[PDB]
Symmetry: C2
Subunit: 236 residues, 2 copies
């Protein structure tokens, strides 16, 4: 029986940082989970609201993209790039095909995930079928409006999750940008929908939580752990 994962990417790719650089998909938040899932025999399909995406430019720097990751990223024939080329649109997705819905991130997600009704519907179905819903970094932004079809209440209500920290936004100086663009942080989303937010000791720590079949991670350093937890949570 083919084990499949639907890996969502932000469809937002535009100027964001004060240096004029664009945000979008944080490379390793898509690549590490991809590698982790593939390693365990899972098939992975990518998807975005528009079927298109762009890379967060800061995630392209050597500090965040190097070694084997950089090699796979540059190799047009890598399993990673070939699968990205087949990225789907929500309409082209058959929710019942997946056991795991994983929301990769980058700040771009703050723009499209909250309003991604179709992806939320898919995630909701996958969860309703007993599958796992995972999100890393700003990925939990998609929990804004994500309803549990069984209870009809927010999927994260009464759940414990983690995700990008408010303090991280402040340290990066993007806090003023989020406010100016009327964007809500992960902690804002958690508070709004009655979820219990549990923070990492430090904003850049590899930190993740598994609450039943709801798995969350804090940042790029947590992408691998988040993917690992999503696989383990299949027994929940």
């Amino acid at each position: 029986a083919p084990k499949k994962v639907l890996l969502a990417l932000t469809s937002y790719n535009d100027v964001f940082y004060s240096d004029g650089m664009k945000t979008g998909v944080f490379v390793v938040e898509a690549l590490h989970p991809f590698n982790t899932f593939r390693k365990e025999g899972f098939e992975v399909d990518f998807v975005s609201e528009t079927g298109k995406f762009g890379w967060d430019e800061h995630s392209l720097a050597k500090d965040f993209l190097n070694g084997q990751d950089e090699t796979d990223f540059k190799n047009k024939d890598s399993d990673f790039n070939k699968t990205l080329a087949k990225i789907k649109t929500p309409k082209e997705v058959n929710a019942d095909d997946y056991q795991i819905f994983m929301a990769s991130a980058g700040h771009g997600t703050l723009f499209d995930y909250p309003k991604a009704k179709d992806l939320q519907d898919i995630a909701s179905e996958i969860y309703a079928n007993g599958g796992v819903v995972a999100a890393v970094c700003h990925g939990p932004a998609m929990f804004d409006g994500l309803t549990d079809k069984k209870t009809g209440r927010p999927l994260i209500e009464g759940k414990s999750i983690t995700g990008f920290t408010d303090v991280g936004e402040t340290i990066m100086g993007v806090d003023s940008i989020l406010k100016a663009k009327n964007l809500a942080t992960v902690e804002d989303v958690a508070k709004k929908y009655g979820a219990k937010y549990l923070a990492p000791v430090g904003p850049w720590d590899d930190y993740s939580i598994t609450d039943g079949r709801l798995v969350t991670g804090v940042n790029p350093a947590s992408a691998h752990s988040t993917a690992v937890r999503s696989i383990d949570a299949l027994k929940n």
Copy 2:
């Protein structure tokens, strides 16, 4: 409400392992937190049910005790040993003198912490006064019967915590000992008192949780992080 920490130690020190070795206080679970609190300007008082304790023999191994830790451990004039020498009994303790109650562990805690009514009352008072209650490894055994003065309900009810894993007991082959000795695991205690147990990816990982002013860690590798968390939590 002075700047002091009450560091609880298990008073149990008897043969426990299959190799005939005894359990007791896991050295680094007392030392690492001790160092962290002292570094941040806190005064530390040690305490145990009987005012006496013994070291877990397996925690004396080089893999668990080495470097500076091993030096401070062997130096009779070390601030650590000098403070350990002044270890108190619950009756000699004044709960209003502490901001943080920290329960160090080692398997021995499974024998005395659940019944340590006097230590639980102290922990309850410290928490009621707005202080922090923390526990690492098997330390959460201290939560068995621990009541929240504000509501009369179990202090951990409705709270998210972590602690030593059931799988870790199995891997160590000590599960048969707990069964024979009618002991409850940390996960058993969380389940019994309505807490949500959040597990680490691996049983030996440095993993900890801060849920308001209730702080928990999984194992020896998590002792430092648990102490760090208890300090940062004083603002929650």
